[PDB]
Amino acid sequence: RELTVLDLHPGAGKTRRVLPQLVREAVKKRLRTVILAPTRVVASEMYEALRGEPIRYMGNEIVDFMCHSTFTMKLLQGVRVPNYNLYIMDEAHFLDPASVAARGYIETRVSMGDAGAIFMTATPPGTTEAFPPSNSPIIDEETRIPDKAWNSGYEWITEFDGRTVWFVHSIKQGAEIGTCLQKAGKKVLYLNRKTFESEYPKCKSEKWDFVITTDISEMGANFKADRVIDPRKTIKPILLDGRVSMQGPIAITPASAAQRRGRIGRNPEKLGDIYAYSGNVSSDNEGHVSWTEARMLLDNVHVQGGVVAQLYTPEREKTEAYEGEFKLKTNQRKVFSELIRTGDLPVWLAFQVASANVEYHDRKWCFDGPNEHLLLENNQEIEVWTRQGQRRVLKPRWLDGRITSDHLNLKSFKEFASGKR
């Protein structure tokens, strides 16, 4: 039937209350259903909320549940995916290109009349409110926030008896801020994609004064906190002159800012909660490779009885690509899908390699580019050791700034270039 968008503000219980209602209805109506979580952590949260329900996690069951990226990767790999009657997408504002492609694919099956869909999120695509409702009033305090260690000033930060979640634009920024806070006698927990599964539980089992987080905590994380500090900065990959570069710190989106603030003001009986913020929000993000990458994904997804999925309607404004531009042949597509899935390469970079007819196991492109593609970290080249073992430096045929944007990306690419994956 229909694509229903339910805007439900942070704390409204999308997962804990609304999702079970939706599931019970779909089970009763005998609708063949998929539930799409943005992350593995949300996935487990949903599981807990949905115990007893006949759900298939990725008896008999007509309801499946998996991540956005799993969904669109299955579609890319051409492994059969059910012709679901109902698609429920959680956190449908998520800008990960796999989420953007899933939206477009889902809206297509709806427009073709194969299915109905429900998109859930506080901040629907096309909408722009940085200060959504909350369970309890939030004090919004525009203020000056340090971007680095400080020796003096900023006493509003440290003279605070409650718990604060501070969003940083990078793991690196988090280390320098967190360390300054620890030197000031504060107990800090660091949350990023490396540290999350072990450190996040500690937010419940330990006493803490600050959580220093990257944007990983914008959706997957519930804190019992009194304050969020949010400089509203990110670093984003921008496509320019046939290469991807990290540009920032730049303003975050209204959706992200709403998610960040949405960490507090969630107990109806608790009034003191503060959102201490600085800077603007921005929807000017067409330069972000993310949108190009969505099209690279979607151009390579088959739709039975239909044609190339366009992006979700309010997101079509984000790209100027023509239908089928990024479509690959069968074998290039396999390479492309595995460069992403197993290689852990960013989508745009995987695309460059695959469309150049490079085979998946052939890593020579990681070393034989022009000198202008010499990768640097801490201002120095990165010497690696391939499968045979002698002196090569990282210098890819195609330049994607994400390779060296943090230590997790760099280590993953060194492993890839060495032929480990």
Does domain 128-234+249-284 fall under CATH 3.40.640.10? My reply is no
As a whole number of angstroms, the longest Cα–Cα distance in the chain is 65
373's torsion region: left (phi>0), alpha (psi -120 to 50) or beta?
alpha
- Do the beta carbons of residue 170 and residue 254 sit within 8 Å? no
| Helix boundaries (H) for 247-346 | 254-261, 289-298, 330-341
Q: Using only C-alpha atoms, what is the Rg of the chain?
A: 22
Domain positions in the chain: 1-127+285-322, 128-234+249-284, 235-248+323-421
CB atoms within 10 A of CB 420: 11
For the four alpha carbons of 376, 379, 380 and 382, in that order, the dihedral sign comes to negative
Structure tokens at 129: 């409110």
Distance between start and end Cα atoms, the chain: 43
- Do the beta carbons of residue 227 and residue 160 sit within 8 Å? yes
- Is 164 annotated in a binding site? The answer is no
d(CA 251, CA 257): 9
- Is 14 annotated in a binding site? The answer is yes
For the four alpha carbons of 198, 67, 94 and 330, in that order, the dihedral sign comes to positive
DSSP letter string, 370-400: -GGG---BTTB--EEE-SS--EEE---SS-B
* Backbone discontinuities in the chain, residue before each (C to N > 2.5 A): 58
- Is 11 annotated in a binding site? The answer is yes
- The gap from C-alpha 252 to its chain's centroid, in whole angstroms, comes to 13
- Is 172 annotated in a binding site? The answer is no
Does domain 1-127+285-322 fall under CATH 1.10.540.10? My reply is no
- Is 9 annotated in a binding site? The answer is yes
**Burial of 75 (C-beta count, 10 Å sphere; 0-12/13-18/19+):** buried
Nearest C-alpha neighbor of 259 from the set 221, 293, 294: 221
45's torsion region: left (phi>0), alpha (psi -120 to 50) or beta?
alpha
d(CA 255, CA 212): 20
Nearest C-alpha neighbor of 230 from the set 140, 160, 155: 140
Looking at residue 229, what DSSP letter applies? Answer: E
- Is 411 annotated in a binding site? The answer is no
d(CA 408, CA 199): 17
Looking at residue 312, what DSSP letter applies? Answer: P
Q: Compute the C-alpha angle 296/297/302, nearest 5°.
A: 115
d(CA 9, CA 266): 10
d(CA 234, CA 263): 18
Helices 68-77 & 330-341, crossing angle to 10 degrees?
A: 150
- Is 318 annotated in a binding site? The answer is no
Summarize the chain as % helix, strand, coil (round to 5).
35, 20, 45
| Helix boundaries (H) for 242-359 | 254-261, 289-298, 330-341, 347-355
Contacts of 84 (CB under 8 A, 6+ apart): 32, 33, 34, 64, 109, 115
**How many helical (H) and strand (E) elements, i.e. helices and strands, does the chain have?**
13, 16
One-letter amino acid at 272 equals G
Q: Are strands 86-90 and 33-37 parallel, antiparallel or unpaired?
A: parallel
Provide the 3-class DSSP secondary structure of residue 162.
Answer: coil
d(CA 363, CA 361): 6
- Is 74 annotated in a binding site? The answer is no
